Amino acid sequence: SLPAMIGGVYSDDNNLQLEATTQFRKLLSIERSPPIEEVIQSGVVPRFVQFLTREDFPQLQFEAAWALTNIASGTSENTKVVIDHGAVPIFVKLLGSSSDDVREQAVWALGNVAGDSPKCRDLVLANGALLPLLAQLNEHTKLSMLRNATWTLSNFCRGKPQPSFEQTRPALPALARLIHSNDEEVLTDACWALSYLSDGTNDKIQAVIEAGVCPRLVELLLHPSPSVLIPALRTVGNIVTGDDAQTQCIIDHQALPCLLSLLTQNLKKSIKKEACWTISNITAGNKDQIQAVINAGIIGPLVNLLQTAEFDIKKEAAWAISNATSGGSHDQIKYLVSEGCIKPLCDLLICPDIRIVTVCLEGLENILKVGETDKTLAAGDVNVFSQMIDEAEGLEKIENLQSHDNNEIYEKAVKILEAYWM
Amino acid sequence: GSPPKKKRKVG
Amino acid sequence: KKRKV
Secondary structure, three states, X not given: OHHXXXXXXXXXXXXXXXXXXXXXXXHHOOOOOOOHHHHHHOOOHHHHHHHHOOOOOHHHHHHXXXXXXXXXXXXXXXXXXXXXXXXXXXHHHHOOOOOHHHHHHHHHHHHHHHOOOHHXXXXXXXXXXXXXXXXXXXXXXXXXXXXXXXXXXXXXXXXXXXXXXXXXXXHHHHHHHHOOOOOHHHHHHHHXXXXXXXXXXXXXXXXXXXXXXXXXXXXXXXXXXXXXXXXXXXXXXXXXXXXXXXXXXXXXXXXXXXXXXXXXXXXXXXXXXXXXXXXXXXXXXXXHHHHHHHHHXXXXXXXXXXXXXXXXXXXXXXXXXXXXXXXXXXXXHHHHHHOOOHHXXXXXXXXXXXXXXXXXXXXXXXXXXXXXXXXXXXXXOOOHHHHHHHHOOHHHHHHHHHHOXXXXXXXXXXXXXXXXXO | OOOXXXXXXXX | OOXXX
């Protein structure tokens, strides 16, 4: 069987070559546990790569590409064999083939190679795969190729360390168009790609925004499929980690009402968590952006999550409320208190995550400052917010933080107690 | 639930 | 306050 197949691929008879290659492909295409190792050891990889260059024989190119694709679907060591035999530049050249089946297969093969690791991704990019890949995406491209190409594109953008932004940037205009697909697989992969490109310094974010994607990304927050929502949400989140003007591009398209709906629908915890995280980077902004959060009606639901949600969600909500107390106006802070934020901030003063304890203490100190200002302006007897913290059992928790191993926490607690309770 | 890094063609 | 990732 295998000896006959090897003989077929190593013959110079067109039909034996095709027959034997096709047999190898079927072998590598079985339901599970394809014998990739055994095919590699048989020594046929170099011949398959030679077959890639037979432009007189598209069917053979296709079968060989399919087989090479499935070998590169295996382990890194499997993939290395394909690389060592020079397949990458040849696949890149096949992106220009007149055969649609061959082109699509080449796109898939390069996706598998780039998916192996950041080094393999970078090798594919360095062999000039990106432009040819984009080159044959147009108004007439069929769905199968659109899906394959979008998936491969996301592989070209994926991974840490991240690919050079100059090498992935040409992808942005195509991705900006692809997120307008209604196909869920295209949307999924295009959004993941944008999630990778938007994760980093603010210049990257700026390039993403300039590609025009904000309006559509926001629409996608309302997509019924979590497979689309998740990466769309991640990309929106990434964008609002940028500066105030960058963050404003998201707010301007009614993102905040969409985000609120993610908090109040019955959605996965991971989704609510990232919605909160996105919101916290908005409340990390200016007073107008904090006001936009308030106006959308987010605070009530957010406070409720801070009080009652799973811990991963509470952590993000804590940052969101605390950021707002830090950047917000006197009057804005008073509104957060009226929505009931004091008690759940106090409850978290005993949580095991010291970063969260610190965030909540900071929030409470900002609230206390507002309460003290209110007292002073009227020449009143009491800081009303200090009494509310006492009633919420926050004061005793802050007292006990004087015993904390962490200096930051310790110094802050003492400072807070000395300023507001003597 | 990230997209696969590699895909084997079975069909 | 801005947190990447």
